[PDB]
Symmetry: D3
Subunit: 156 residues, 6 copies
């Protein structure tokens, strides 16, 4: 109720974290109706989320659901916390299902200052992300920061 999609959408977005990176395979999901986090499922695979994973509050993608976001970070961020992030790209898949890739803003961590587009990350990292969402499904590929921004805007 008191939290929006960002300070400066689409350049900066607020992301509510649902699942911490490098956590056990527990898929938490915020339940709008209950106003609480629920265990959606234990993953049937010995896999973990490769980045902090959550959503942009008050967005509505095609499915009616909020825009999902991967936030790369140096340390896991707890479920329930808001992090100020900036998109750098989007992973596009058919099951169409997109996942924004974002990094913390310079205010939050300067480590990622040099990541301006998804391709500024190591390809091994990008490939690990697309593998996760495939095998945990057809992966169309990565698209650039502008496409991600446009997707965020259309969901507002």
């Amino acid at each position: 109720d008191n939290v929006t999609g960002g300070d400066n959408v689409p350049k900066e977005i607020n992301v509510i974290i649902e699942i911490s990176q490098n956590s056990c395979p527990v898929k938490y999901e915020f339940d709008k109706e209950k106003n609480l986090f629920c265990v959606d499922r234990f993953l049937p695979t010995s896999m973990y989320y490769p980045c902090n994973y959550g959503f942009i509050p008050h967005t509505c993608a095609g499915d009616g659901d909020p825009v999902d976001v991967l936030v790369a970070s140096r340390f896991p961020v707890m479920s329930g916390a808001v992090i100020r992030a900036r998109p750098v790209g989007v992973l596009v898949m058919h099951d169409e299902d997109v996942k924004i890739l974002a990094v913390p803003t310079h205010k939050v961590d300067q480590y990622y200052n040099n990541i301006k587009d998804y391709s500024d990350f190591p390809v091994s990292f990008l490939n690990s992300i697309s593998h996760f969402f495939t095998f945990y499904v057809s992966v169309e590929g990565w698209k650039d920061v502008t496409v991600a921004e446009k997707l965020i805007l259309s969901a507002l």
Copy 2:
């Protein structure tokens, strides 16, 4: 306010987790009046909760307090999260004080599909649970899924 005791009480119950299994000996407790989790105590024993431990929202047992539930799981579930569970038994103790034993529903984890009654678990596991609540108190023993269901119904 927006969360009930279950989808399909008593066959399925919502459980709000207070304490994660295999966590440090911190006894958290949801405080209705504060509407927040509080540290009830640090356990005076080098013991930890043998399963995720919490309560069924909007139940009222004899003591006036909600029904307490142990949820066995493959990984710890965070305090505050709702998990959909199904009872399989009840641990009955005198201090009378009962603890429902439940497993995640098939939707949440299929690992426990074959646990239909408490006696389907290894006896070593069941014994570990009764030891915990004794020594962390007189343990009457285990009773079956039907008794657990009846207890849940009487608390609605």
Copy 3:
């Protein structure tokens, strides 16, 4: 809204934990306006909070901000949890900026029963705390339980 500064201010205080001791360098902060925890920043230093760190709800120090409290404990307490604590001292710094040092009440953990004043802790511990806040800034030093209590009262 439903939680106050303490049962028995200033002898006992409620503290809402923001950051767990011995956690990753993630500075969480409760955001009054959003009514949610936010990532203030990832610490630019390979440092961690030396005690559970949080605030006394409904206090207003000079800066307008709630009184901050370090709660020493045997195990980390999760962000969001309320712990009943008792002040034993205050760390006074110029950037003036004070941090209450408190321990869990006897109800919560009897380990700290013998800590009645900050000087009852090992000096190595006290020094570790002042080093943290300096280097993560001029440290004026420690002041006693009475001063801490008076500071808490002036913030009510």
Copy 4:
């Protein structure tokens, strides 16, 4: 030098753990020549070993390498530790590459007393294991405890 393949091969086997279950994606490997554990690699996938993983000392499979073993357990076992286990099955793959599935002996943990063959585990668990080794490669399937025992004997 001072550790053998088991007390009672093939019914009981000693397994030297290399990688703990539910650990970070670090593939450790014992290096015979160095007589030390080495980081073989960081896994290119956001995957973790689904069970404790290691080898039977002084075995020699077809590849010349020791027999590899997954040991299911209630808690991770540290790299370097010997655990007394008993095979219950084998996962057979083509890249031929087999992985023994074993459980702790009754002496070590009675939880698994009722697992006498791999099929006594939940199918979801078995499927998680075969998925891991595929996607972290052609999986032929599971074979029974007798086949696993025969494989262990041929490697002595």
Copy 5:
């Protein structure tokens, strides 16, 4: 072979850690014959070792086995590591079975400088230790640093 019982027995002792404090219930044990750590057992109780637990190398108590030592510490110490400690007391039990209680030397951590005898710890802590060894057995009680030293000397 290259490690002794202490620099300055019995005032200072070397302790080889077998089990870390606040670890999962895995009882590791150094096996002299194998020259490796082995899983003795998974504890049948949801209990954990209340302090780092290990032995003094090249001691021989009545049972023929090395002297066992609990080392209190601020953080867990890994299995396999040597820590320089100083005894402060002994927990005496009948099953006779004694456990030395020791703290890190001032060189290793100054936190414990003020612990010169077991009774300098909070009674809640001491009681937690005796409860653990009872319920994980008849506890005779605590004896002072001099008795502990004499026990260490008789085992040399």
Copy 6:
């Protein structure tokens, strides 16, 4: 005895890890004489090692001691493990005391393929490292991969 300083010194070095990154403040140190890891000390500061920290076996710097190395990695590496790394720079300090900065080789993790010199890391990261060694002492600054290589060669 059976492990050397590297495959291809100085372009590639073997590093024996002593302390894991993001671990508790326990300074472990390999003791040549005991042939075991020892607790050197608990750090007097609420600080942790910013990278995996260890040494190159069979090197001898000016002090007579092996060359120390920070190995940046995506996940902590356990104490005792050998990792194949490549130097990218050196942190030079006066107390002269140098710390090699290295990354895993492409074989071990491709994430760091693009780090060829220390300056390819974010400055915030480099600054965090120099702060750690100062405050856990005069920091002269960073020098390039060639200087690091020359230092490694002079220690052979």
